[PDB]
Each structure stands twice: as structure tokens, then as C-alpha cells.
Symmetry: C4
Amino acid sequence: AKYYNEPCHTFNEYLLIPGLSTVDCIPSNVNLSTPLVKFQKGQQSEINLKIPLVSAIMQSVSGEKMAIALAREGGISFIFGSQSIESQAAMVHAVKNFKAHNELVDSQKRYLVGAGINTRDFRERVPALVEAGADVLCIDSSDGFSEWQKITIGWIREKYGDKVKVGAGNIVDGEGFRYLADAGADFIKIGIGGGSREQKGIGRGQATAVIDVVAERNKYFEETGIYIPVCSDGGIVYDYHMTLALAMGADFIMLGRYFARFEESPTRKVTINGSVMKEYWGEGSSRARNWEGVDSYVPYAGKLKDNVEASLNKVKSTMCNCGALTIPQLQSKAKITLVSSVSI
Amino acid sequence: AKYYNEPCHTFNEYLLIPGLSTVDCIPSNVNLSTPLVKFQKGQQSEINLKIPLVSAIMQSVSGEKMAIALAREGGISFIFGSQSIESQAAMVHAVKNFKAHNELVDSQKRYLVGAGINTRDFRERVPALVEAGADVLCIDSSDGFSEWQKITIGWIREKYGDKVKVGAGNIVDGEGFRYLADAGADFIKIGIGGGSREQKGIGRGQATAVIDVVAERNKYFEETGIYIPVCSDGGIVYDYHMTLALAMGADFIMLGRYFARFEESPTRKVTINGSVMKEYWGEGSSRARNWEGVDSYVPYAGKLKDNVEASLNKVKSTMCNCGALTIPQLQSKAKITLVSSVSI
Amino acid sequence: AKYYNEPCHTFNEYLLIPGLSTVDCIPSNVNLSTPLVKFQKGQQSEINLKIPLVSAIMQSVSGEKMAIALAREGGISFIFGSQSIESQAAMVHAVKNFKAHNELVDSQKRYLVGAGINTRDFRERVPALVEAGADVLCIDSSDGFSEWQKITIGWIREKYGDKVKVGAGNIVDGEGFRYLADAGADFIKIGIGGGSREQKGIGRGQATAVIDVVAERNKYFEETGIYIPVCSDGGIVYDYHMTLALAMGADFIMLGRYFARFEESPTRKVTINGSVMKEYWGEGSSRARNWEGVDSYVPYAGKLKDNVEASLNKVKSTMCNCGALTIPQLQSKAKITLVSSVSI
Amino acid sequence: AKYYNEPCHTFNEYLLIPGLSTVDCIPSNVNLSTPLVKFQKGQQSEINLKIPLVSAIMQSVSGEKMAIALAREGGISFIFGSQSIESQAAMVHAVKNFKAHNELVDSQKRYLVGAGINTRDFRERVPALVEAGADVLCIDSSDGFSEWQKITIGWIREKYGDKVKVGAGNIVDGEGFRYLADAGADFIKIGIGGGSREQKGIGRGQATAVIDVVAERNKYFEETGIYIPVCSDGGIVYDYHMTLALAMGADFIMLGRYFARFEESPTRKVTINGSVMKEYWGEGSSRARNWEGVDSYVPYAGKLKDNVEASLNKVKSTMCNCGALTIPQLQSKAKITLVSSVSI
Ligand SMILES: NC(=O)c1ccc[n+]([C@@H]2O[C@H](COP(=O)([O-])OP(=O)(O)OC[C@@H]3O[C@H](n4cnc5c(N)ncnc54)[C@H](O)[C@@H]3O)[C@@H](O)[C@H]2O)c1
Ligand SMILES: NC(=O)c1ccc[n+]([C@@H]2O[C@H](COP(=O)([O-])OP(=O)(O)OC[C@@H]3O[C@H](n4cnc5c(N)ncnc54)[C@H](O)[C@@H]3O)[C@@H](O)[C@H]2O)c1
Ligand SMILES: NC(=O)c1ccc[n+]([C@@H]2O[C@H](COP(=O)([O-])OP(=O)(O)OC[C@@H]3O[C@H](n4cnc5c(N)ncnc54)[C@H](O)[C@@H]3O)[C@@H](O)[C@H]2O)c1
Ligand SMILES: NC(=O)c1ccc[n+]([C@@H]2O[C@H](COP(=O)([O-])OP(=O)(O)OC[C@@H]3O[C@H](n4cnc5c(N)ncnc54)[C@H](O)[C@@H]3O)[C@@H](O)[C@H]2O)c1
Ligand SMILES: O=c1[nH]c(=O)c2[nH+]cn([C@@H]3O[C@H](COP(=O)(O)O)[C@@H](O)[C@H]3O)c2[nH]1
Ligand SMILES: O=c1[nH]c(=O)c2[nH+]cn([C@@H]3O[C@H](COP(=O)(O)O)[C@@H](O)[C@H]3O)c2[nH]1
Ligand SMILES: O=c1[nH]c(=O)c2[nH+]cn([C@@H]3O[C@H](COP(=O)(O)O)[C@@H](O)[C@H]3O)c2[nH]1
Ligand SMILES: O=c1[nH]c(=O)c2[nH+]cn([C@@H]3O[C@H](COP(=O)(O)O)[C@@H](O)[C@H]3O)c2[nH]1
Ligand SMILES: [K+]
Ligand SMILES: [K+]
Ligand SMILES: [K+]
Ligand SMILES: [K+]
């Protein structure tokens, strides 16, 4: 077997050491724009998020209202694919035709929206999603280091060329990244065993996963001239974990629990002895996938807007402490230290 | 004294990083066959388990019903030797004559069964066990790095040559493995201070023990052409620990607590305030060895079959995530990372 | 991004290994004097504390009574600047005119006192503080690696030259130290995420911060001939942490919680079911800064004098165990070992 | 300051890996004899304990009955010196004249006994102790790396030459050992911050302390031909810690809590709601030193004999697992591994 020189680590094991903060770095001047899909050196991504946050491909988080609410703030949602092709396409269509400063929209001023797909019924689901107006797709899987994903991306390329964007994942190392990059993925999702590994035994600390995949992505860019955006998926407990994920190289972040707490999540608001909660279950739980996970409750946080703006104001503030006015500048200037077990 | 460069680790400190999963790796195509006794390069083992699980040499787990139930699933039990020679031989005989797709049987279609022996009364116990039809024997001891075991194996060779198979142990390092290999053991058992060390002070994290013994076993194979199967004994808390043990090099796994929970274990089923439990005590407890351990209760799990098949389906699934269709392929392709203290 | 070879550590992870204790090292012969402001090689600091303790720039700790009580023992307080320029100046004036063996005083026998300033209204606050008689100033900020601080120090130099002393901070690495040193700081404060980091994600274990800044300060001294005193600010839970901070290179220590417990702190004494407590809130809490922190209670300790003398007697005693009669000798002879996670 | 490459560790962080156990290593054949005082290469120590255990120099453990009871088993007690010279001498005399297979006695068949002394009134205490018949003395101090101890040993040599044996300590590193060795100590005691460091901040994990001091002691032996026995003092929680301490190089072990639990300890037996306890307080507690420590209760264990024999049977058993029939052989053959934080 193959072993590693160092153990893997989670976001909770890191802290950022401040860099020079210039008089021009104030939160309001921080640009949180970020590329969503791959492009060649020298060019810009065809799709850029206004904020580096995307909602998880889950029944309990990415519904119509979520997609609309997040797009309004500059991010994008990936309508869950764990439902009929007709239902998902309908949700996508509803978001695209809803309108009939930081909002994420297309050339027709319609909100952007994503849609998750699986490596099984894509020959029928994809066309339906494209026709419905889906701006981007993403293969939804825990272990994306699979030939099934290569086959799915290949089919999409054969039928649509590079006109249909498709993210792939999840992977946690350079080999997995490399495989999906060569297969043609527009963006690669990072993360196995991090979300809200102690059942199947597969996974890797999210921080180590991001750091290693990013190094491979950069190596890949230097070899091919192709920059593939990567997504840190899961493992984000606190707002500062967002800044860490971005500083370590992730272009954007996918979150489930974070968004499930909002009024716009498609789950029922339930009051548990004085506390308003919201339902939240994984796609691997028996409660789903029947149209690897648990079924629980998250504290109600109110509307997405206020929470997202508060979280991002914190990120912007921290970025200025690190002397960065943009995500790429943060990824370049960030000083990241591991913290001792005892300190935690 | 002799010290080591790194501290030892337990199974709980590791995770598997996925490898390429091909379209042909589906759980139903995973072969869990594994060698039980030593053979030379180029040949096959005279005895191959259908599944890599064997029940512990304990009064509270390996009785007749257990031996039969496990053999039916492809594994083998080692009837405890902590009883009279006549009683143990009778149990062995009963299993061999019980019948008067994955079942483990001999050329006469009789279920395979093992029997534990000690380094004291073997001159009388062994012949009785051989006559009773025992398919394989195993010296039952915590510290197998002993001249007493060399003497026992030597006596068996002198009287039966290589016609009677005998496992030895336990050891936790290359030196101990080497000593039992040269003594003639057919398979070497790994593990001291792991089962369900804080009393005598001897032992080693199971993971480190397996990894180090396996490296020595491989070195030994390259030097002599003799492949000696090794058994990871104890320290398995969760199903994924099985996959880890196998990925690290163990050919098969010995378990006590895991099997004690089943209806077929020879212990009394007791109800403790709404919970059906089963008795489970170590061979080192005063409750035994009078014909180093504790006496407790384990939650009732039902019949062996359903539990074993569920556990192995998980192992098979994980093996496919690692791109392996067989145990040897898993041992070759597995990517194993240590996890930080804080992550746990 | 930039990463580090080792994780950071806190004071709790260290212990001092005794050195040779000579017959002349008795507690009463230990000199705790220490430089407060920078000087060139070969000279003495214009301001030397009698004891290496200074009270934090906080509303809940450094008021008039505190400043007087601490100065009487040989230390100095930094009257909080989170109040009107007129109020702070009045407090400073009151301390300077209060008197109208180890007391810290000026040539006119008046108690020494410090005052915190911010990088915003200093053009008006500073002159008022100088006129009021403030002996030293200190820019109060969490992230002192800022151009705003360079600008503030520069303004002070342009108007007062080196006649007005001003400390700066906080920083946690060599780069931050270097930046404030070149900007002209008279002393640099160390510490971010240590006080009584899990919200913004910035910081560093106090021990690592002190050790690294001190090495840079020493390197800086060798290159320029300028010795800049450094202050370990926050992260001191137990008395022995003081000895550690000093042994690691800090010239003096800034504390908040420690002094807030005293009768002389400006907070209300409140009895909570049999226990007399005192209020203590951070400057980052909403409870302040409205003229990043929590609002709590600390156990009443009585008058500053008895507590400070008890704490320092312990430090002196430990210094003798290390064979040191002075802080510089301690910094030179101290043997400091990290302790394992498990030992704690 | 001086730092170290690795953090220090405690006994709880180690385990012994078995070595070859020969047919001749049975517990009853294990020799636990060990040297108490220094000798030159090629010779034997003038005083050899029958068992490697000595009771602590404490008011709550080493009284007359303890000294007699331990000597009967082969060990020796050090009558506490924290009492009047007349009282201590009387206790020593009482043990020497008490009798007016493994017992530790002199040429006149009288039980051996030790006595603690301080670096203050030794000019009067020592002569009284020698006249009373004390077989060995030991300077009782937490930080023995002191000129006061050198002065005390020097005075003893000047007046008695090498006819009066005196142990010194405590130290935790090679430098401290070296200093007391050159000063003339007959045996050096190891241990600061281990007994039943979080107050003064000085100390070192007991295991690291023993390992480092032993390496220096061996280096010293090779340079001078003088073998100085070392004593692991404190930090022993479980019986197996004894085996570890000996395996790491300690010739003998000093214990307080362990012996305080016995009927023969000089403390009052008190019943606390169904549990018979015994008082146990440190020499640094206010409860003493008035003729750094806590005052507590330890569970009653009964008479010393049965407990000591049970503890040593375990040590002997473990020694055989390591292939050792004697302590020196154990120190030579022991395989000691550090254990991960998580494993504990
Ligand atoms: N990130 C994690 O750690 C994690 C863990 C568990 C579950 N999940 C989530 O649960 C949901 C399902 O994930 P998943 O990976 O278990 O589902 P998946 O569809 O990606 O799983 C594919 C695996 O390959 C098999 N297979 C056999 N033939 C196949 C074919 N023709 N095409 C594709 N696969 C074939 C099975 O489908 C098996 O599920 C997702 O939302 C995923 O994110 C995530
Ligand atoms: N794996 C562990 O960590 C662990 C720990 C404690 C107990 N156990 C279990 O307890 C049971 C007993 O194990 P054990 O090792 O204590 O028993 P064992 O029979 O292997 O022990 C042999 C040891 O050598 C001695 N000895 C002296 N003469 C001997 C002779 N002629 N032949 C053999 N030994 C001689 C004693 O028997 C002593 O018990 C086993 O089932 C074992 O698995 C396991
Ligand atoms: N040490 C720590 O870890 C920590 C953490 C949080 C808060 N605090 C305390 O809270 C109090 C406030 O600290 P702070 O650093 O948040 O306040 P600060 O005044 O030092 O913060 C300056 C930051 O730059 C911005 N800025 C924009 N224009 C500016 C200008 N012209 N001049 C200066 N800054 C400008 C904002 O003021 C922003 O607060 C202090 O007492 C500080 O010690 C300490
Ligand atoms: N091992 C530990 O970690 C630890 C910690 C605290 C206390 N203790 C115990 O408490 C008891 C007292 O230990 P201690 O070291 O505090 O006492 P000690 O007598 O060894 O201490 C000597 C120190 O030097 C000073 N000194 C000044 N003049 C002196 C002189 N002329 N001679 C000697 N010392 C002079 C003081 O006495 C001061 O106590 C002992 O039993 C000791 O084992 C042990
Ligand atoms: O172990 C898992 N069991 C599940 O049932 C499950 N469902 C989703 N996911 C994955 O978790 C991400 C969301 O994580 P957070 O809630 O931590 O943001 C998601 O974006 C997915 O990557 C699962 N992981
Ligand atoms: O410390 C011990 N004290 C005992 O009394 C004892 N009895 C058995 N064994 C050993 O433990 C293995 C079973 O472990 P699990 O329950 O963890 O599967 C078994 O297979 C044995 O190796 C003991 N170990
Ligand atoms: O995280 C923080 N939030 C706050 O609100 C805050 N207020 C003060 N400080 C800083 O803490 C130091 C005092 O710490 P102690 O109480 O630990 O001595 C002080 O000297 C400051 O450096 C803060 N840090
Ligand atoms: O920190 C301490 N405060 C005290 O008051 C104290 N009194 C004794 N000792 C030392 O501890 C040893 C006994 O330890 P155990 O109870 O762990 O065997 C003893 O042998 C001494 O080395 C003290 N250490
Ligand atoms: K900064
Ligand atoms: K895979
Ligand atoms: K000393
Ligand atoms: K052995």
C-alpha cells in the first residue's frame, strides 16, 4: 500500500497570520468574484460568481427559493438531482423564468442556476436540464474518482462540446483531480468525509484535501495552460473556515448545513421546545435516494441575505488583515499556520 | 534499550483515499478469498477462506454453533482450547460430522473448523484434535515470541511433518514474526493490547503492528520464497477497520467481540432493562482459564449471517472505491493516510 | 500561500528545566527591572519598569486607581483610549498629579502612566495626552501590521521627534515586528488570539508568537544596533506563564483578566451566590467601542499589591531555579521544553 | 534560551514490545536485585536492594513501621527529615534495633534504613543520623541542581570520606546529573513535576527525564569508570510504569502515593462513606514543612507485603515477556515504543 509522510488535517487546525494591511484595504473595496468554469491562460472564465458560495446538491437545501435567494446575492445553487428528471427540470425552469446589484445573472438578466446529475440516467436528464435552461451542471457523487464520471463527461462533450459546463467530483488528492481534469471536467469538487468516513473509512481532512488538490491544479495549469476552478465541498463549521478554504486555493465553497438553516431552504420549519429548527438530512440517508448520512435539525437562522452578508463581511475583513483585496491575491499572500492539538 | 522513530497507531487513526474505480468494480464482483496457511512462490495455499474472517479462540465466542455458522459464510472458527482435551475434540468432531454457495468445506464437503492449542499439553491435545478432524490448529497465547511455541511447532513437525497446519502468535513486530516463521508456523497472528496493555504494559497499536509485521513477512517472502499468511487479531471496533486491516497487509482477521454479539455465540442471552445483551469475557479473566481480561456484555446483534454479509458488503464497496476486486489487489493499490489527533 | 514547518504552541505547552542555582540566587536578590522603550547598543532605556507587568488598554482594567496601584508596585498602566480625548487626558492628568520603594516615577517623583491611542483621531488625542503628562503612548489594535499604524507613528515623529514614546502592535511574526520597527515603534506588542481567533480565524499561539518575534528582534538588533523591547500581550492564565513569557524573550507582559480581578479595577464588584466577582469585557465587545470580544465575570482577588507580590515572588523563585538573577540573564540561561499533548 | 528537538513524555505514553522469552524465564527465576550506591567498573555496589523499590522522603509515608515493612520485602525507606533531628534519629535508631528470606539487612542482620536530609542543618543532623545507625542518606529537594547540595555533599566527604553514603537530587537532565555526580553523590534522584509543574512551571515528563539522565549516566560511566545508580522518583501511577522506569535505565524507584495506601504508612486510616482511605500530603503542602503540594486521601490497600509482591510479580512476568531475568538485562534488551495521543 501507499502511505503518506504527514497525517491529514481539518480547517479547525489552522489560523491565518496577518500580512501588511494597506490603507486601501477596507471591506467595501474587497472583490469576492471568482471563476466557476475552466479557461485557458490569459483569458477569463465564462462564468464568474459574485461571491464564492454555492449551495449543496441536496434535497434539504437547494430548491427553487434557495437558488433564487442565493443567485440574488451573487452565488449559485445546484438544484438537487435526487428527484425525477421532470421535477428537477421544472425547478430549473422556474428559476430561469422567475423574473417574468450583486445578483448573478446571464445575458438575458435571468438568475443563474446549476443542477446536479448522476452517472446513471444522464442521457435523458442532461438534455432535459439543458432545455430547461440550466447554466451549469455538476455530477453529484461522493467518490468521483470513477470511470463512470469519465464516461458521463465524455458523453456530454460528444453531444455538446464545450457549450455545456459540467463539474465533477468528489476527489481529495492530486490523482483524483488529474483524472477528472483529463476527462474534461469544467470544475472539480473536493471533499470526502467532512460534511456535517466513520462508516466506510474513506476520506481525508478537508484542509489537506484542498491544499493537495490545489497544488496539483496549479501544476496542471503550468503544464497545459488550463486553469480548472476547484470547489471545497463540506467541512465548513465556522465563517472563518471559508476564508481558510479560499486562502488554501479553493476558488469557491459548497455548503449544505450553512444554507439549510435559512428560511429559503425547502425543509419544514419545526419548533423544538422554544427553538425554531429546520430539517437537514444527507443525500446518503435512507430518508432520500429512494425516489451514508444522518437526519437532523439545524437552528433557524432567518433569511439567507442577512446571514450571507454577515459571513462575507467577516471574510472581507479577514482578507484585509491578510492584505488581500481579491481571492487570487489572498491565495497568493496568505500565511497559514497549523495549530497544536492542545491549543484546540 | 531500543526505541523507535515514530509512536504506534491504532486503526481509528487511518482513512483510505479512493483510487480509480473502474466500471467493472461492483460489490458483487469482489472476491474476498484469502490464504490461511503458508505456501511457496508460484503456488496456492492448501486452505483458502471464502471470507477473511475467523472467530477468536475464546470460550465466549467459538463454540460449535459459531463454527458451523461462520463456516457456512466462508470463514472459520477456532474452537477454544481452554477446556478439556476431550470436550474440545468432541466439539471439533461435532462440527466435522454435522452434515450427516460460500460455505467453507473440505473435499468430503464437511465444514472446516480450527482448534486452539496451548504450549503445555499439546502432546496429548494435538493427536486428539487431529483424530477428531480439526482442519487447522493455532497456538493460543498473548506473547507468542516464546521458545515454548517454537518447541510446540517443532513437536508437531516431528510427528506430522507439514500435514498438520498450525498457526502461531501473537507477535507485533518483525523480530517476533521472523522467529515464528523460522520455527515453522503456517500463519502468524498479530496483536497484543488491542482487543475490547494498561495492566502489564506490553503491546503496540494494532495498525503499526500489522504494517510492520507485513513488511517483514514480505521481506521474508523475497528471501525464502515462502509466503506466510498473517492474521490481524483484535482491535477492530468498526466495519471499516476490517478494510484497513486487509489494506495494510493482513490476509485475514480474528475477532472476538464482533462474533460474541451473535445468537450463535455460546453465551447466555440476557436482557438488561429493555436491551438484549450477550456475555463476553476474555480468556485472561478469572471467569476462565480455571478449568488480564474483563467480563462484560455486548449488544445482541441477531444471527451471524445477516451481520457478516452487511459488514462484508461494506468492505466490498470500499474496496471498489479503492479500485480493488480482490484482497491482494487492495493490499497493492490502497492509499492509506494517518489522521490528526484533533480530527478524531 | 505560505505555510510553516511546525504548528504554533501556547504557554501551557511548555515547562522550564532547572539550571544551576548558586548560593547567591535567593528571591530577594532577584532584579525584575526591564526596558520599556528602544535604545541603541551600549545604552540604557530611558524608561525602565521596576517589574515586568503592565495593565491592558481596556475600559474594564486600566483606570486611574489601577494606574496608581500598579505604578506603586513598579509597573505601568495604559489608560484606555476607548473614551473621549478629554476623559482619557483627565485620567492621565489625575494620575500625574495624584501626589499633590519600588514605585515607578519620573524625575518629579510623579507616578508613571501610559495611554492607549488609535490610528484615527491621534492628531487631536496625542497632543492632549502629551499635555496631560502621559509618559508613554501605545497604539491599541489587534492587527498592528497596518499602514495606519505606520502613518500614526510617522505623524508622532514628525511633530515630536523621539521625545514622545509610542508602542505599536499587535503582531505575531518577524515580518510584522520588522514593519513596526522600521516605522519607528519604541516597543512592539505581541499577540493575536490569546486573551481570555475562533471568530475571524487570525492569530498564533502566544508562545510561538513571542519566540519568533524575539528572534527577529534580536536579528534586528544585530543589524541596526537598535534594541526594541517587546511585550507579550495576553494568553497568560497562570503565574508560571509569566516566567515562560519572560524566558522566551518578552521584556514585559501586558495583562487584562489578571488585573481586572483586583479592587482597583474600574468595574463593579458583584456578588454571585456567595462569590464576589468583578466585571470583565473585551474592547471588541459591543459593550464597548461605542462611545470580537465577550462580556464576563472574574473572581475577586482583593487588592493589586498582595496579588502582584505573590505572583512575582513565584517568578523570582523560579528564576533562581533557572540560575537567573535578572530577566536578561533568564532569557539567556532558560532551558525550555515543549510538553506532549497527553502530558496535559 | 535553549530549546529541545522533541517534547517530553510521561510513562503513560509508552508500551513494551516483547522480546524472545526463553524456557528459563519464569517469574520465580527473576532476580530484582539492584545497586543503591556508586561503585567503579568491575566491582559491585556496597549496598544492593533485594527489590527496586524505596519509599518517599515524606511525613505521610516513610515512618518506622514503613521502613521495617519495606526492608522485610527487600527495599528501603528514607525516614522523612521534615521533623526534628532528635525525632528522625530516634526513628532511625528504632528501625536499626527492632530485632532486639528477602529482607534487606546489614552484616549484623539489622534492617537497612535511609534518612532524608536538607541542605540547611546537615552539620548537626548528619552526625546524629550516622550515630543513630542510618545506612544511607539522601538530600531531599525538588531542585537538586543547586550549589547548596554540592556544599552539603562536600561537607559529608570532608568529614566522613566515602564511608557515609548520600544520594542527591532531584534533577531531570544530563547537566543536573553531571553536576551532582562531580559533586560526589552516591546516587542521583530523577524527577520534578511528576508526583501525584502547574504552579511554578518547572519540570519534565518523567520518562524523558529518566531516559536523558540515564544516557548521561552511561556516558559518565564510560568516561570515568564510575557507575552512579539513578532513582526514578514519582510519576508512577500503575504497576507497569515500574517496569518501564526500570527498562528505561532507572536502577530503582521512589514512590509516595503507592506506599501511603498501606497500613504501615504513618497516617490515619479514615472511612469516607463506605470507603477506607488514608491521608496523603506532599512535603510542599502547608500541612508540613512547618515544624507546592496538596493534601488528599488514597484508597486503603492493606498491608505492604501482599501489594508489593503482587506488583513485583507483574514486573517479573513482564520482564520475562521481554526476555530478561535481571534488571540490567531488561535495560539492555527492552524494546520501548511511544504511543500516539489518540491511542490513549
Ligand atoms: N462526500 C461524501 O463524503 C459523501 C458520502 C456519502 C454520500 N454522499 C452523497 O450521497 C449522494 C449519492 O452519492 P453516491 O456517490 O453514493 O452515489 P453515486 O451514484 O455516485 O454512486 C455510484 C456507485 O457506483 C455504482 N454503480 C454501478 N453501476 C453504475 C453506473 N452505471 N453508474 C454509476 N454508478 C454505478 C453504484 O451506483 C454506487 O452508488 C450524493 O449527493 C453524495 O454527495 C457524499
Ligand atoms: N492478546 C493479548 O493482548 C492477550 C492478553 C492477555 C491474555 N490473552 C489471552 O489469554 C489466554 C491465555 O494467554 P497466555 O499467553 O496468558 O497463556 P500462555 O499459556 O500462552 O502463557 C504462557 C506463559 O509462560 C509460562 N510457562 C511456564 N512453563 C510453561 C510451559 N511449559 N509451556 C507454556 N508456558 C509456560 C506460563 O504458562 C505463562 O502463562 C489466551 O487466549 C490469550 O489470547 C491475550
Ligand atoms: N488582540 C486581539 O486578538 C484582539 C481581537 C479583537 C479586538 N481586540 C481589541 O479591540 C480594540 C479595537 O481593536 P481593532 O484592531 O478592532 O480596532 P482598530 O482601530 O485597530 O481597527 C482598524 C481597522 O482598520 C479600519 N480602518 C479604516 N480606516 C481607518 C483609519 N483611517 N484608521 C484606522 N483604521 C481604519 C477599521 O478602523 C478597522 O477597525 C482594541 O483594544 C484591541 O486590542 C484585540
Ligand atoms: N519533586 C518536586 O517536583 C517537588 C516540588 C515541590 C516540593 N517538593 C518537596 O518538598 C520538600 C521541600 O523541597 P524544597 O526543594 O522546596 O526544599 P529545599 O530545602 O530543597 O529548598 C531550597 C531552596 O533554596 C533556598 N535556600 C536559601 N538558603 C539556603 C540554604 N542555606 N540551604 C538550602 N537552601 C537555601 C530555600 O531554602 C529554598 O527552599 C521536599 O520533600 C521536596 O521533595 C518536591
Ligand atoms: O457523508 C455524507 N453523507 C450524506 O448523506 C451526505 N449528503 C451529502 N453529503 C456531502 O456533504 C456536503 C455538505 O456538507 P456540510 O453540511 O458540512 O456543508 C454536500 O455538498 C456533499 O458533498 C454527504 N456526506
Ligand atoms: O487483553 C486481553 N485479555 C483477555 O482476557 C483476552 N482474551 C482474549 N484476548 C485477545 O483478544 C482478541 C479479541 O478481541 P476483540 O474482542 O477486540 O475482537 C482475541 O482473539 C485474543 O487475541 C484478550 N486480550
Ligand atoms: O479577542 C479579543 N477580543 C476583545 O474584545 C479584546 N479586548 C482586548 N483584547 C486583547 O486581550 C488582552 C488581554 O488578555 P488577557 O485577559 O488574556 O490578559 C488585551 O491586552 C488585548 O490585546 C481582546 N482580544
Ligand atoms: O510537587 C510536589 N509537591 C509536594 O508537596 C511534594 N512532596 C513530595 N513530592 C515529590 O513526589 C514524590 C512522590 O510521588 P508519588 O506520590 O507520585 O509517588 C516524592 O518522592 C517527591 O519527589 C512533591 N512534589
Ligand atoms: K495586517
Ligand atoms: K474511486
Ligand atoms: K537549579
Ligand atoms: K516474549
